[PDB]
Swiss-Prot record:
Impact when changing G37S: No functional consequences; no negative effect on protein stability, enzyme activity and thermal stability
Posttranslational mods: Undergoes proteolytic cleavage in the C-terminal region corresponding to the loss of approximately 12 AA residues from the C-terminus. Glutarylated. Glutarylation levels increase during fasting.
Localization annotation: Mitochondrion; Nucleus, Nucleolus; Cell membrane
Modified residues (N6-succinyllysine): K17, K21, K100, K127
Phosphoserine found at: S87
Gene name of this polypeptide: CPS1
Expressed in which tissues: Primarily in the liver and small intestine.
Annotated residues for binding of N-acetyl-L-glutamate: T52, T55, W71, N93, N96, N105
UniProt-recorded name of the protein: Carbamoyl-phosphate synthase [ammonia], mitochondrial
Residues of the full protein shown: 1343 to 1478 of 1500
Domain commentary: The type-1 glutamine amidotransferase domain is defective.
Quaternary structure note: Can form homooligomers (monomers as predominant form and dimers).
Domain MGS-like residue range list: 16-134
């Protein structure tokens, strides 16, 4: 494979650029309790949050606004379309053992990297990305 327009634009970046638009949130259902706090914090900082339907509804039900998106396999807007037109400039995709979503998660991570979008796949990092008031 190769990278294209989105990727080249990323190679022109400085390295200090911090996401501003929206954040796609992908997490295993069972990890919801611990993540809610980080989500709320990201929201309270001006980020628009996007998540797969079930997760988006859970977020909203817990005072954290979020827009639902469809799983690539179940194509609710398309994740690639959002990443493609700049609505999502950061992707949080943490481990998920659900067989039903393993490929979708692979595809989501690959789409982010292919377009030079920062990808957070560890909760530690993600955890500080929010507290840092960043």
């Amino acid at each position: 494979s190769s990278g294209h327009t989105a990727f080249l634009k990323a190679m022109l970046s400085t390295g200090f650029k911090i996401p501003q638009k929206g954040i796609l949130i992908g997490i295993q259902q069972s990890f919801r309790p611990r993540f809610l706090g980080v989500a709320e914090q990201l929201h309270n900082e001006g980020f628009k949050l996007f998540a797969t339907e079930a997760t988006s509804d859970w977020l909203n039900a817990n005072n954290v606004p979020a827009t639902p998106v469809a799983w690539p396999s179940q194509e609710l807007s398309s994740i690639r379309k959002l990443i493609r037109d700049g609505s999502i400039d950061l992707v949080i995709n943490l481990p998920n053992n659900n067989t039903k979503f393993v490929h979708d998660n692979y595809v989501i991570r690959r789409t982010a990297v292919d377009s030079g979008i920062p990808l957070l796949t560890n909760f530690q990092v993600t955890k500080l990305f929010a507290e840092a008031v960043q």
